[PDB]
Ligand binder design. Structure first.
Ligand SMILES: [Mg+2]
Ligand SMILES: [Mg+2]
Ligand SMILES: [Mg+2]
Ligand SMILES: [Mg+2]
Ligand SMILES: [Mg+2]
Ligand SMILES: [Mg+2]
Ligand SMILES: [Mg+2]
Ligand SMILES: [Mg+2]
Ligand SMILES: [Mg+2]
Ligand SMILES: [Mg+2]
Ligand SMILES: [Mg+2]
Ligand SMILES: [Mg+2]
Ligand SMILES: [Mg+2]
Ligand SMILES: [Mg+2]
Ligand SMILES: [Mg+2]
Ligand SMILES: [Mg+2]
Ligand SMILES: [Mg+2]
Ligand SMILES: [Mg+2]
Ligand SMILES: [Mg+2]
Ligand SMILES: [Mg+2]
Ligand SMILES: [Mg+2]
Ligand SMILES: [Mg+2]
Ligand SMILES: [Mg+2]
Ligand SMILES: [Mg+2]
Ligand SMILES: [Mg+2]
Ligand SMILES: [Mg+2]
Ligand SMILES: [Mg+2]
Ligand SMILES: [Mg+2]
Ligand SMILES: [Mg+2]
Ligand SMILES: [Mg+2]
Ligand SMILES: [Mg+2]
Ligand SMILES: [Mg+2]
Ligand SMILES: [Mg+2]
Ligand SMILES: [Mg+2]
Ligand SMILES: [Mg+2]
Ligand SMILES: [Mg+2]
Ligand SMILES: [Zn+2]
Lengths: 155, 127, 80, 98, 24, 60, 118
RNA sequence: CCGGGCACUCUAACGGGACUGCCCGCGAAAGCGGGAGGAAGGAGGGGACGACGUCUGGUCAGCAUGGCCCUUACGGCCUGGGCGACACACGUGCUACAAUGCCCACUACAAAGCGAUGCCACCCGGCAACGGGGAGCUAAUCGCAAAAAGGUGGGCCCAGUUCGGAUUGGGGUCUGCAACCCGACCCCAUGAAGCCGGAAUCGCUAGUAAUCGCGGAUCAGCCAUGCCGCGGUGAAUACG
């Protein structure tokens, strides 16, 4: 985006929960443009999370997404030769895409055979503070506060 | 007695004949859910009725031909919204913020010579 | 996987030539530019010079090689 | 049953040829079916723009055959009266079947 | 996949017919 | 191409399979459209000239 | 369960388990399971010996199989190798036979790459 | 399907429609921000269209052409071979390494094109490629035709496998005078590498990328996974 601000895409509210964060998470599950398959994954994964746990899958989905949001991260910036890992805050929009992408990526690193099993189990572990996605988040905030010595290169 | 709108989306048409009744919907001589239902997005086509709470008022007999089934669902959505305004023109002010009466002008972009599929450029090496 | 399906093809050049050589007993080398043709039982025991495009190569024709074509035994390429 | 099949590469020639035929047959015959338009057969030719490659520069052309139908219903004479040889259009081409 | 000719999908990928993809 | 290679016209080819297209105008061997009997290069030159009826510029 | 010359598939569906025999693919196993009237879906461990003997009976002498096949194929090479056949020449030097290109991509037949200088 | 009708879908010809025209704010103006109405808005989306000139760019092998050479030969005919060679190297692609998957049965929704000895419904033979017979169509009327992903049901259960389809043996169909070099296709058997790829590097900003099939040009046939088009499903992201 050199000219404009590159406005954000406004996604369709969910057919089931009427929530836009659901659809956005469904889209990250989708591959090769099979949105019908990707929805049946997520919704069948909502049956799993709501049976094995007596709670509402909507609230666990959000509570999981929240625990994976990183408050800071590191970027590179060319300064006097070789560049540096520079810690800086994360836009509230970027906390969206990162937490969602991480959850889907983590769940597919999982042992479980079927897809919806892995989604539900990940969401549950993530909402409890463990699981693969929260590791990528706790490891990123570790990059910052380690390179905290370059907080003057904010940019 | 009866109200109608055309509706169109991405090379697909669905004639929507709205008739006051129990609330059962027929599509191509089949149940609404014998045609769809294996398709999650199907219930979107009936969102015009839910916006005005017209679920239990009307039956619907629909003829859909052309395109694939997902565009057929959007074409129904429009035909349902179009007939819905011909019934009561006061339903424009309610249906319009949601944009159900807007046609979706997005169609498959034409393939172009020298590319692979109309935007995707053949990959090169330079060495 | 090789198929001619019926009327197994053999050129008329050598066909009338070979069957007439049998009535007079086995002859010496024979000139052939038609490798199009297959091999039939009545060739066994003769010798036939098939063309490479460059040279004529004598080919002793035996029982085991009936089913094939001339030029299967007259290779074209020259490598190493 | 009188079928009249109009075909031509120019859509202005057909309409100029069809409209002239209805104006002769409407003075005599019944309400004619009318100039019903049949779909077009579009042959396309893609050709590389120059000689001797630059494969990726082709320009293409199309040649379109538009079709029309006439169908006079119950015509006897004063229809066929003006229908022997009065037409102007050249690039048009007409066939008749019964 | 599309490479196995004696699978159905490998038949439609080549546009052919046979035992592993009849006509009707 | 070569004058002697326009023996296609005289075919009597001794085998049907030896009949080939041979663009009439320029004597092109390689790329000959069968409907105009012209090569792709002759086709393009005659199109621009306007001597092919009904052949427009394609655009869509 | 020993079906052919020594051949022991186990614990899987029988049709898929016969594939572990040399001269048997999916086509021949589906045929034996048919002409012998045996449910294909049964596990090998659950096989009746009365069905196992019926299978051995068919398969063993209906088609030539593991030991003989390898010999027959190998003898079918020597045959077109011992005659001057071109096909036999391509078999000698270890090159493709079906008329493929060798300038690249001979790898399966040609013993993966052995590089030289330039 | 018939009677019947043009309302609807559609087909294909002519028109209407959008102009910062209207409201608020800023501005000297041009314009920018936002709002209503509207199918559509600030260039609505996509094409055709590429300035004075540059690179002594590319092509005398499409054609034209100055000059120079050849003229029982650099020309001409034919049969055969080669353009397909293989110890290697790069480019462009295809198919994959799998469970968001593979296979089997059942079932549903496209657009754009092609076809008179050609497309070939349908019937019989054949596991099949295909053969015999034969209907219709100068084709919005008949045919290629089946779209595929998709959906419902079942099988596979994480394994070089029911992943993958290379290689190779064997049997056969068709085109063609003729498939040895050197064709595609069908059937049986064989079932390799490959368990997401080092340095490096490529494409796309929305019906886009990714994925899924469909058709066509040349052509008897076809080494087309190429090319040019067609529609189905349909994202991520742009602080700067
Ligand atoms: Mg530097
Ligand atoms: Mg640096
Ligand atoms: Mg660095
Ligand atoms: Mg650094
Ligand atoms: Mg597409
Ligand atoms: Mg288009
Ligand atoms: Mg290219
Ligand atoms: Mg090209
Ligand atoms: Mg260009
Ligand atoms: Mg397979
Ligand atoms: Mg010349
Ligand atoms: Mg030819
Ligand atoms: Mg000439
Ligand atoms: Mg525009
Ligand atoms: Mg424009
Ligand atoms: Mg425009
Ligand atoms: Mg130069
Ligand atoms: Mg120049
Ligand atoms: Mg000229
Ligand atoms: Mg070449
Ligand atoms: Mg060498
Ligand atoms: Mg050497
Ligand atoms: Mg049919
Ligand atoms: Mg049959
Ligand atoms: Mg008609
Ligand atoms: Mg009709
Ligand atoms: Mg007609
Ligand atoms: Mg299933
Ligand atoms: Mg291995
Ligand atoms: Mg396997
Ligand atoms: Mg594996
Ligand atoms: Mg752009
Ligand atoms: Mg073809
Ligand atoms: Mg080949
Ligand atoms: Mg092809
Ligand atoms: Mg194709
Ligand atoms: Zn020409």
């Amino acid at each position: 985006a050199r000219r404009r601000r590159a406005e954000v895409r406004q996604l369709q509210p969910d057919l089931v929960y009427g929530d836009v964060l659901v659809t956005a998470f469904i889209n990250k599950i989708m591959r090769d443009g099979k949105k019908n398959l990707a929805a049946r994954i997520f919704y069948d994964a909502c049956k799993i999370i709501q049976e094995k746990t007596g709670q509402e899958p909507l609230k666990v989905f959000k509570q999981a997404v929240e625990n994976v949001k990183p408050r800071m991260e590191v970027r590179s910036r060319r300064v006097g030769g070789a560049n540096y890992q520079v810690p800086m805050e994360v836009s509230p929009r970027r906390q969206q895409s990162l937490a969602l992408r991480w959850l889907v990526q983590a769940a597919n690193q999982r042992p479980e055979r079927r897809a919806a099993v892995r989604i539900a189990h990940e969401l549950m572990d993530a909402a409890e503070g463990k699981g693969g996605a929260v590791k990528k988040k706790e490891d990123v905030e570790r990059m910052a506060e380690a390179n905290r010595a370059y907080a003057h290169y904010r940019w | 007695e009866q109200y109608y709108g055309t509706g169109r989306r991405k090379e697909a048409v669905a004639r929507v004949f709205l008739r006051p009744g129990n609330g059962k919907v027929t599509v191509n001589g089949q149940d609404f859910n014998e045609y769809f239902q294996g398709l999650v997005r199907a219930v979107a086509a009936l969102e015009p009725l839910r916006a005005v709470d017209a679920l239990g008022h009307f039956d619907a007999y629909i003829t859909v031909r052309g395109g694939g089934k997902s565009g057929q669902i959007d074409a129904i959505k429009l035909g349902i919204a179009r007939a819905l305004v011909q019934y009561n023109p006061d339903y424009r002010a309610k249906l319009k913020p949601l944009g159900f009466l807007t046609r979706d002008a997005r169609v498959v972009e034409r393939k172009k010579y020298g590319k692979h599929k109309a935007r995707r450029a053949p990959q090169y090496s330079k060495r | 996987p090789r198929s001619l399906k019926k009327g197994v093809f053999v050129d008329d050049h050598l066909l009338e030539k070979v069957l007439e050589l049998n009535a007079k007993g086995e002859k010496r080398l024979i000139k052939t530019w038609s490798r199009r043709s297959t091999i039939v039982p009545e060739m066994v025991g003769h010798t036939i010079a098939v063309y490479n495009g460059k040279q004529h190569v004598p080919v002793y024709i035996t029982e085991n090689m009936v089913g094939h074509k001339l030029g299967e035994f007259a290779p074209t390429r020259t490598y190493r | 049953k009188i079928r009249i099949k109009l075909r031509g590469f120019d859509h202005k020639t057909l309409d100029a040829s069809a409209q002239k035929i209805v104006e002769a047959a409407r003075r005599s015959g019944a309400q004619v079916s009318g100039p019903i338009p049949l779909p077009t057969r579009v042959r396309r030719f893609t050709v590389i723009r120059g000689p001797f490659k630059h494969k990726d520069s082709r320009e293409h052309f199309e040649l379109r055959t538009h079709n029309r139908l006439v169908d006079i219903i119950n015509p006897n004479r004063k229809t066929i009266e003006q229908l022997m040889t009065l037409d102007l259009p050249t690039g048009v081409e007409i066939e008749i079947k019964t | 996949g599309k490479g196995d000719r004696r699978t159905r999908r490998g038949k439609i990928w080549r546009g052919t017919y046979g035992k592993y993809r009849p006509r009707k | 191409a070569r004058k002697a290679l326009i023996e296609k016209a005289k075919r009597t080819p001794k085998f049907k399979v030896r009949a080939y297209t041979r663009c009439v105008r320029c004597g092109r061997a390689r790329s000959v459209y069968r409907f105009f009997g012209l090569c792709r290069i002759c086709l393009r030159e005659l199109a621009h000239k306007g001597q092919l009826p009904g052949v427009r510029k394609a655009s869509w | 369960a020993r079906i052919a010359g020594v051949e022991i598939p186990r614990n899987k569906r029988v049709d898929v388990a016969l594939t572990y025999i040399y001269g048997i693919g999916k086509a021949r196993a589906k045929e034996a399971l048919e002409k012998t009237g045996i449910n294909p879906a049964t596990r090998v461990k659950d096989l009746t010996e009365a069905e196992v003997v019926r299978l051995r009976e068919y398969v063993e002498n209906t088609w030539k199989l593991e030991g003989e096949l390898r010999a027959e194929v190998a003898a079918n090479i020597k045959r077109l190798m011992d005659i001057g056949c071109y096909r036999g020449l391509r078999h000698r030097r270890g090159l493709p036979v079906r008329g493929q290109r060798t300038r690249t991509n001979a790898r399966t037949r040609k013993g993966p790459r052995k590089t030289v200088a330039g």
